[PDB]
Amino acid sequence: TKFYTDAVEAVKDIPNGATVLVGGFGLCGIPENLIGALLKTGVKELTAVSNNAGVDNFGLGLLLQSKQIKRMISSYVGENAEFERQYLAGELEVELTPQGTLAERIRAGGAGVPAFYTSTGYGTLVQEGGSPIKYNKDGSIAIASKPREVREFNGQHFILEEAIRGDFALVKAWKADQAGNVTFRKSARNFNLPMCKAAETTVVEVEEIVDIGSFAPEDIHIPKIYVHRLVKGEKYEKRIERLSVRKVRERIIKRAALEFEDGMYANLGIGIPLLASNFISPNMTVHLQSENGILGLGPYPLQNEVDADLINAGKETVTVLPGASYFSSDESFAMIRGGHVNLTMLGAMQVSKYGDLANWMIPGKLVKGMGGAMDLVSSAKTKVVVTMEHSAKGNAHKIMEKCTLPLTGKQCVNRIITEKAVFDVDRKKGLTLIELWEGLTVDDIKKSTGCDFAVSPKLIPMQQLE
Amino acid sequence: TKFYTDAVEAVKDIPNGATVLVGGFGLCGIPENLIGALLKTGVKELTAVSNNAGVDNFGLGLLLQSKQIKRMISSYVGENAEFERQYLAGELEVELTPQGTLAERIRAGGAGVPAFYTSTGYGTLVQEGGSPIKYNKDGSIAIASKPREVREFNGQHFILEEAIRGDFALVKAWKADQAGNVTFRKSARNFNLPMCKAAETTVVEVEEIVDIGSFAPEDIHIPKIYVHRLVKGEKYEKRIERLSVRKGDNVRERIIKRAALEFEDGMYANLGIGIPLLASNFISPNMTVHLQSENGILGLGPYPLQNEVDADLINAGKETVTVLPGASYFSSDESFAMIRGGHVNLTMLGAMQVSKYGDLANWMIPGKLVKGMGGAMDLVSSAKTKVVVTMEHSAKGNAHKIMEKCTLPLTGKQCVNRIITEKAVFDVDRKKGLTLIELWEGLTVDDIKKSTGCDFAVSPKLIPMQQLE
Ligand SMILES: [Cl-]
């Protein structure tokens, strides 16, 4: 590990057109001093592999502001209007990649694996191709994504994904010893760990440099072999994107809250699912998983508990309960993709008769990326429960024969909770109405549902947890 | 995580014919109480996925002794005569699997990846098939290994490997908190970490149970989500297979002293048993060389003084070792991500045979040496890592070891970059072949020609062979 005192000196040899991996989840664990040094060097035409695009005026967005990035390989755009503008305008190329796939491909790229199989993205634009990579000025499409090869293993369909390797990696970490060993703090680890292994030259910035021997050798997160250039960061602004402090929808939330069991491992999506966790009994123990690499999510912090290094999947500041753990992004999606999480509960725009899901794209309106949504529904072992309003504007169908919006996954939903009904979903037999809201009838549900359904002989009135 | 006080209660529901992953590198990090419970239950016909077979009378060897294992999926047999016997006799089925491939397949099995590609085992019996899985009573092959599909990526050949997943995993760990989170001590981590993620039911035994909050959350090695059943182990014998402690002819010494010139300052190296590891003694104190061990250590130091000895800290040869300041420990899957990814600068190992273009044979002598390949096939798999072979120039009866084509089973194809012998030093190219770059004093190019089974170019800057004293 070569030590540097000046960050510009550490990155001055990056060529134009280089592929650069950039650590960070939102603004959590971003290499802000190295990004700052790239503004000064002015290197351009970069293919930046990064999970998100930061915000409009910070993180990776700064390099979009200076037009130094040609292509983005990312999972979620988020709250970067400049990102969205440049992409829609035809100025920026963007490969929207499932977050777990992005993580595993970076890992493969550092672990000598050229390609591997995953069910994430099967039956979607990732697999079929045609995902817009570049737009023309006129509004038509310039570059579209190529299909991924499909292959069946053990009665199930998977797609082939190729390793991602960088010319450079720009990495943020908490501490480094004088030998070059590195550690990360809380959820600031995310993509920084795998990216540190998947590039020809890895440049790491750290908040503190400690003595050799300071780390327990078991607790070194990235061994020195992976760290090629090390710099102590001059300025750390501890920026927080979304402060979240503590001091008919309600119907869906209270029914969703009945999905939680004692000792359950759950990943809850933004909105209704996460709000349902408030109604969990104190006597019930539910461990909440976060895809950015946390197990054991707690409530939002009090003012004094706030931390830039600890955010949830929605980029909101959070806390952790006792017995929580932190891990890398590759590992978080190994967790998710392996079916280790008992319940995934997320919102939806559309569900089909056999459990196809659409919840990430509305063409020419919502193109922020899929995030970890496609990995979260990929396992058959994990119970996927959808929470949504029954019908759309003009009483248009959301539950239907076939989805009209782009798919997050095929035959992946196990249960649908709405304000009117609760449905069990089967991949072969279709929908079964198992709970019905009081005052409504089976005929009311039929004319709010775009496909037919069986009725359970033990149909009960819909439950609520108060 | 369900806590148990009795180990037999934790494992009593394992069915006959089950596939069971078993943690451990040799006798380092083995689940000895769970293995002990399996003796009592008497479950049989198991397919045991384990890196090694322990020893004759301990670890996984105990279950071989009781004939409870039908098939072994392993990388290295080692010092277990009973295994070798049962395997050769036709009583035991054995899939010899490259250690890093075994590690990555276990990982894939826990991470939702059904298959993936690797160059490890290409051009060998792993890829081409025909590796003996079962022998007949007459000594013929009853079951042979099937071929692996080959595919080219970026101008290079790789083989497809499928995920390994267990019905059960038997795992040894250092400490667990009351929440079920787990940690490992030193090199006892090895295969225990990945195996904890790749089974339907994972059963972990630990030396100590601490309270929740004892671990820094960043430093939890296996989060509770992976730990299904936890037991505090009753007895820990701290067994050491090979005690090696600190207080060889001139021809070997010659190879060692030239091998020692391969080390550079700031180099990352993985050194094999024998000559390569001995060459590390000759490294200058002013030179910093970080030694990597495939069982999951970076920063190997010398052998321990009597009081420094530790059952949890051994090298790839199963010998007790120490670590230098700034060392780190990691899982097996991670160690071979390291190796397979070309992160180690120099791999230096012994060989039985090297070919003109760098094919290597150093793991099998049919009907004589069938202990498995260990991590040897992964160690030569990367093009980024300089592979340097250290060996005697010729064999018994002045038979060739450097030759046109290897006659022994291959560790890898076109994977050796340099060959150091007591007579010569050769640069090896995959396209152009051998080039004599150093020549031992007193010998001539003609002497080398009649000790070498293929032709070779001579360097115009051929120097006398170097020695570091
Ligand atoms: Cl995201």
Swiss-Prot record, chain A:
<dbReference type="InterPro" id="IPR014388">
    <property type="entry name" value="3-oxoacid_CoA-transferase"/>
</dbReference>
<keyword id="KW-0496">Mitochondrion</keyword>
<comment type="subunit">
    <text>Homodimer. Only one subunit is competent to transfer the CoA moiety to the acceptor carboxylate (3-oxo acid).</text>
</comment>
<dbReference type="InterPro" id="IPR012791">
    <property type="entry name" value="3-oxoacid_CoA-transf_B"/>
</dbReference>
<feature type="active site" description="5-glutamyl coenzyme A thioester intermediate">
    <location>
        <position position="291"/>
    </location>
</feature>
<dbReference type="InterPro" id="IPR004164">
    <property type="entry name" value="CoA_transf_AS"/>
</dbReference>
<comment type="similarity">
    <text>Belongs to the 3-oxoacid CoA-transferase family.</text>
</comment>
<dbReference type="InterPro" id="IPR004163">
    <property type="entry name" value="CoA_transf_BS"/>
</dbReference>
<feature type="modified residue" description="Phosphoserine">
    <location>
        <position position="131"/>
    </location>
</feature>
<dbReference type="GO" id="GO:0008260">
    <property type="term" value="F:succinyl-CoA:3-oxo-acid CoA-transferase activity"/>
</dbReference>
<comment type="pathway">
    <text>Ketone metabolism; succinyl-CoA degradation; acetoacetyl-CoA from succinyl-CoA: step 1/1.</text>
</comment>
<dbReference type="GO" id="GO:0042803">
    <property type="term" value="F:protein homodimerization activity"/>
</dbReference>
<keyword id="KW-0808">Transferase</keyword>
<protein>
    <recommendedName>
        <fullName>Succinyl-CoA:3-ketoacid coenzyme A transferase 1, mitochondrial</fullName>
        <ecNumber>2.8.3.5</ecNumber>
    </recommendedName>
</protein>
<dbReference type="InterPro" id="IPR004165">
    <property type="entry name" value="CoA_trans_fam_I"/>
</dbReference>
<feature type="modified residue" description="N6-succinyllysine">
    <location>
        <position position="146"/>
    </location>
</feature>
<keyword id="KW-0809">Transit peptide</keyword>
<keyword id="KW-0443">Lipid metabolism</keyword>
<feature type="modified residue" description="N6-succinyllysine">
    <location>
        <position position="402"/>
    </location>
</feature>
<dbReference type="InterPro" id="IPR012792">
    <property type="entry name" value="3-oxoacid_CoA-transf_A"/>
</dbReference>
<dbReference type="Pfam" id="PF01144">
    <property type="entry name" value="CoA_trans"/>
</dbReference>
<feature type="modified residue" description="N6-succinyllysine">
    <location>
        <position position="368"/>
    </location>
</feature>
<dbReference type="GO" id="GO:0005739">
    <property type="term" value="C:mitochondrion"/>
</dbReference>
<dbReference type="GO" id="GO:1902224">
    <property type="term" value="P:ketone body metabolic process"/>
</dbReference>
<dbReference type="InterPro" id="IPR037171">
    <property type="entry name" value="NagB/RpiA_transferase-like"/>
</dbReference>
<keyword id="KW-0597">Phosphoprotein</keyword>
<comment type="function">
    <text>Key enzyme for ketone body catabolism. Catalyzes the first, rate-limiting step of ketone body utilization in extrahepatic tissues, by transferring coenzyme A (CoA) from a donor thiolester species (succinyl-CoA) to an acceptor carboxylate (acetoacetate), and produces acetoacetyl-CoA. Acetoacetyl-CoA is further metabolized by acetoacetyl-CoA thiolase into two acetyl-CoA molecules which enter the citric acid cycle for energy production.</text>
</comment>
<dbReference type="GO" id="GO:0046952">
    <property type="term" value="P:ketone body catabolic process"/>
</dbReference>
<feature type="modified residue" description="N6-succinyllysine">
    <location>
        <position position="365"/>
    </location>
</feature>
